[PDB]
Each structure stands twice: as C-alpha cells, then as structure tokens.
Design a protein around this ligand. Structure first.
Ligand SMILES: *[C@]1(C(=O)N[C@H](C(=O)N[C@H](C(=O)O)[C@@H](C)CC)[C@@H](C)O)O[C@@H]1C(=O)OCC
Length: 251
C-alpha cells in the first residue's frame, strides 16, 4: 500500500468524492456518511454518476437504522441500501434528483451568512415519491447495494478496502476541541464528550511524521478545512477505526 492515498485524485471521473454536504440542524450524520460513500462507490463500480439521497435514507429506513435526526446506526444504513435501495437526491433547494435534502444548510460552529445550526430538528416524513418534474418514478429510481459489511478495526485492512473499493463510512467520539478544527492532524486533548459522529473516510497520508485519515465531514464547506479534516491514524484514536462499514453496488 502507498504511503498516501486520496480517492479524489485516484478516481477523477467521480466528482461526488470531492463533495461536502450539509446535514443541517439534524443528527443525520449516520445517513450522510453512508449516502456519500455510496454515491462514490456507485460511480467507482459502474464505469454512472448519482447523488444518492440523504433524504431517502434519513426518512425511510426506520428503526433498522436507528432514530432519524436523533441519531442512527451506520451499518443499518448500508443494509437499507441493499434491502430497499436508495433513490437520487441532491442538496437542499437544488431540485436535483428524486428526493433532494429537505433540511436547510446552516453554520456548524463557525460564523457565516447562513443561520446558525440548532439542535432541534425533526425527522422529515418518508415520502415514496419524487419531486415534481423528475423522472423516473420513486420505485424506478432506486439504486440497490448487493452487499453490506463491516471492516475490522485494523488499519491495514481499512486502507486496503478504501484502496480497492473506495471511500467507506466510519464514526468517532467527538469532544468539544474537535468543533474548532481548522487544519493539521486532529488529536483529542480536551473538551467534554459530545457524542458519536459518523463520517466518510476517503484516504490517508502523513503530515509532519503524523499518520492520518483523510475525512469528509457533513457540516458544509466553511467548517474545518473546506469541509474536510485529518485525524490521527493507526491508534484507533477516538475510535476512528472501530466502526468502519461499507458495501458494494449491484451489478
Ligand atoms: C451523528 C451526528 O449527526 N452528529 C451530531 C452533529 O453532527 N451535530 C451538528 C453539529 O454539531 O454541527 C448539529 C447541527 C445537529 C444536532 C453530534 C452528536 O456530533 O448523532 C448522529 C449519529 O447517528 O451518531 C451515531 C454514529
């Protein structure tokens, strides 16, 4: 395996890999890390390009994935992709795809032109229909996964999975000092525990002798390093290597 790897550079024909979404004022990171990595993989393993709907995952999976905007289970999200499939759906107000995200973007621990994010956000309804004007139907727009698995808490196995099959979804414990991340390799030193946070791991590298994971957050582009961040790799730091999940698209 190479010393560094950036899925963005390795799969140039898959622009979703470079995208950063905004989960809005809703605890839907579990769903976002999933649809983001799924969008990347559909492109990687089908050379088709599709913005997988965070809305479809968030609203229609149900108990199998947890509790919507109240948090969920990453592995459960990939299961939904294989069982019910996922329709397309772009950013809030984009009118792209069957079911675009319905929760407005906001400022995540940063100042900006958008309204500040709030904790209170209700899970939207599971509507099995597409926005007006979009074709095909909701049912016909479903994209299915043909496998859903969990990668072991093993640095090398995780790197190999990304190297071969593309970005994966992971999760780590967020402490308050992470909220102010701007650059460099994040290492937890202080702050009260905020809770688990699901994200998308798309690569790895070494910065100033410090090995790290290249990660895409779902708090828009004005948070962190253009929406991305790097976190210590190899020591299951904050559990970053303890909850890796992925899957492969059908055909
Ligand atoms: C994962 C999750 O969504 N994380 C939360 C989050 O992103 N909070 C944002 C924020 O801090 O900007 C606000 C705007 C929404 C409440 C927090 C807990 O980090 O609860 C979600 C989940 O499914 O966790 C299990 C992996």
């Amino acid at each position: 395996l190479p010393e560094s790897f950036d899925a963005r550079e390795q799969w140039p024909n898959c622009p979703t890999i470079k995208e950063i979404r905004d989960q809005g004022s809703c605890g839907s990171c579990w769903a976002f890390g999933a649809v983001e990595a799924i969008s990347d993989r559909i492109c990687i393993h089908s050379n088709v390009n599709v913005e997988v709907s965070a809305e479809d995952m968030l609203t229609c999976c149900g108990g199998e994935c947890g509790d919507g905007c109240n948090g969920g289970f990453p592995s459960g999200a990939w299961n939904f992709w294989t069982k019910k499939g996922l329709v397309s759906g772009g950013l809030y107000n984009s009118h792209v795809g069957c079911r675009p995200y319905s929760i407005p973007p906001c400022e995540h621990h940063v100042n900006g032109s958008r309204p500040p994010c709030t904790g209170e956000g209700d899970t939207p309804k599971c509507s099995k229909t597409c926005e007006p004007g979009y074709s095909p139907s909701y049912k016909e727009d479903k994209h299915f996964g043909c496998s859903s698995y969990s990668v072991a808490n093993n640095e090398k196995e995780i790197m190999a999975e990304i190297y071969k099959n593309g970005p994966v979804e992971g999760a780590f414990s967020v402490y308050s000092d992470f909220l102010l991340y701007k650059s460099g390799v994040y290492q937890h030193v202080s702050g009260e525990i905020m809770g688990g946070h699901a994200i998308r791991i798309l690569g790895w590298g070494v910065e100033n002798g410090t090995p790290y994971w290249l990660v895409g957050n779902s708090w828009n582009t004005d948070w962190g390093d253009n929406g991305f961040f790097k976190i210590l790799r190899g020591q299951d730091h904050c559990g970053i290597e303890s909850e890796i999940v992925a899957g492969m698209p059908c055909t």
